[PDB]
Amino acid sequence: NYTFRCLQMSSFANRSWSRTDSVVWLGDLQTHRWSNDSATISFTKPWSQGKLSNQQWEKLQHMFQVYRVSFTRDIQELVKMMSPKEDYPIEIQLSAGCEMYPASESFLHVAFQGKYVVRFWGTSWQTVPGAPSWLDLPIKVLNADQGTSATVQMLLNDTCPLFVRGLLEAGKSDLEKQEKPVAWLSSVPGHRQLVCHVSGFYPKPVWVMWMRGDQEQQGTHRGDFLPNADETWYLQATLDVEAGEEAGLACRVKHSSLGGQDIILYW
Amino acid sequence: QKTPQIQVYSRHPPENGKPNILNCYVTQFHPPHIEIQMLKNGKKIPKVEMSDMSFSKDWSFYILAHTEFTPTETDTYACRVKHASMAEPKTVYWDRDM
Ligand SMILES: CCCCCCCC(=O)N[C@@H](CO[C@H]1O[C@H](CO)[C@H](O)[C@H](O)[C@H]1O)[C@H](O)[C@H](O)CCCC(=O)NCCCCCCc1ccccc1
Ligand SMILES: *[C@@H]1O[C@H](CO[C@@H]2O[C@@H](C)[C@@H](O)[C@@H](O)[C@@H]2O)[C@@H](O[C@@H]2O[C@H](CO)[C@@H](O)[C@H](O)[C@H]2NC(C)=O)[C@H](O)[C@H]1NC(C)=O
Ligand SMILES: CCCCCCCCCCCCCCCC(=O)O
Ligand SMILES: *[C@@H]1O[C@H](CO)[C@@H](O)[C@H](O)[C@H]1NC(C)=O
Numbered sequence: 001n002y003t004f005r006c007l008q009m010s011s012f013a014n015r016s017w018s019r020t021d022s023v024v025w026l027g028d029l030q031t032h033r034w035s036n037d038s039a040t041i042s043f044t045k046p047w048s049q050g051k052l053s054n055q056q057w058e059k060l061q062h063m064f065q066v067y068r069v070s071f072t073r074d075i076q077e078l079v080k081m082m083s084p085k086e087d088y089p090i091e092i093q094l095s096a097g098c099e100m101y102p103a104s105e106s107f108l109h110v111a112f113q114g115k116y117v118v119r120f121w122g123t124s125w126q127t128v129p130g131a132p133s134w135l136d137l138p139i140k141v142l143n144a145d146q147g148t149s150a151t152v153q154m155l156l157n158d159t160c161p162l163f164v165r166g167l168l169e170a171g172k173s174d175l176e177k178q179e180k181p182v183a184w185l186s187s188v189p190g191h192r193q194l195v196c197h198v199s200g201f202y203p204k205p206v207w208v209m210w211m212r213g214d215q216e217q218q219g220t221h222r223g224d225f226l227p228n229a230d231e232t233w234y235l236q237a238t239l240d241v242e243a244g245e246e247a248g249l250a251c252r253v254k255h256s257s258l259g260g261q262d263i264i265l266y267w
Numbered sequence: 268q269k270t271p272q273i274q275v276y277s278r279h280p281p282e283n284g285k286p287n288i289l290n291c292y293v294t295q296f297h298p299p300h301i302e303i304q305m306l307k308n309g310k311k312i313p314k315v316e317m318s319d320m321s322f323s324k325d326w327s328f329y330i331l332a333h334t335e336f337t338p339t340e341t342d343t344y345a346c347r348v349k350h351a352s353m354a355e356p357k358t359v360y361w362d363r364d365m
Binding site for chain 2: 007009011021023025030033089091093095111114115116182184186187188193195197199200224226227228229230234236
């Protein structure tokens, strides 16, 4: 299963300053970038056009080029219309895409000042429960635009899963790449914290544990997955130990890339 | 407004005198406007590369900064962030042992 996410970030500082920037992700790999600076969407993989022809891609891009301009104008007009009730600065985020199953489901969610307020669902825009009531009228106005409603329906129902099917084929060697973890041990300060660092692995699923022989040390505290700049992952796992009890401890790492041979480092 | 969290970590196992890459991963902030500096002995490192800003399921923003570095026994490295959520810049030091 892969989740395809198109993320739009728009900042409106005042009536004369705004920018809209977007990034696109297939699972954890970035496939596109669209800077406010650029007239066109940029591929960040060789395979970011998927299986769409140049014609299909250019049609899709043109639609987005029109949307970016129209969106910016629409938000600026709404803020003028509503001033001084709602005013600058304004942050709007959109998260749209689909999640693929062995079948697919699409989504389009919108946040205002960092809070989820609106989604597209079925054939119309809707405010979510608890959204500010001042959004109801502009959503009504947006729902009157049937041309936009039909386009969004096509994008979510048809284009998203289509496009993603082609990405999965075209990007197969990257999506299924295997990169090996490299691990190392260190410690920070009658107790101390031992740290097992694991870096450079892909794909994301990994197992890291402090061990005494074949006994898992349940004190093992796994950190978050942190990105490296070369599309691999970093993770560390710590263990608080009483001085004296450090002897006999090891860090064990399991990962798909290692061919059944776990890494084991001894403290 | 959400306050940025900062994590500083090396790409490869650190060995003194050996070129490496230092990462500064900044997360959980809002609004997206932010300034991120990486420092060597308290001085700004000029060649710092940034990923494209993105955001998580919870709508909070994240971004990765990184730079080439060669750790030594005596050099200190840090990542310093200015953001509207904080009156003072926040500095996190790299500690190879941490
Ligand atoms: C990611 C969604 C996919 C974008 C497809 C939009 C099609 C489009 O560009 N259409 C705009 C112009 O449409 C006009 O030309 C079309 C043909 O090119 C059709 O003929 C259409 O009938 C015609 O009107 C249109 O102006 C549209 O309103 C652009 C903005 C789209 C928009 O406010 N989408 C909702 C997402 C933001 C909602 C945020 C709600 C909100 C408001 C304020 C604060 C926070 C949140
Ligand atoms: C597009 O599909 C919707 C239903 O799909 C859901 O909403 C989409 C936006 C997307 O998020 C999907 O993953 C979701 O599963 C159709 O809307 C339905 O239409 C029927 C009648 O034909 C209606 O009775 C239902 O109430 C609608 N469903 C909902 C949940 O409201 C829509 O018509 C499709 N449009 C096109 C052009 O194909
Ligand atoms: C907005 C959701 C669209 C879903 C259909 C996916 C079609 C492929 C998208 C190609 C890259 C889009 C980059 C721009 C994203 C944006 O402006 O919101
Ligand atoms: C963003 O792009 C628009 C459209 O090209 C441009 O007019 C605007 O000045 C840009 N904003 C910034 C802050 O550069």
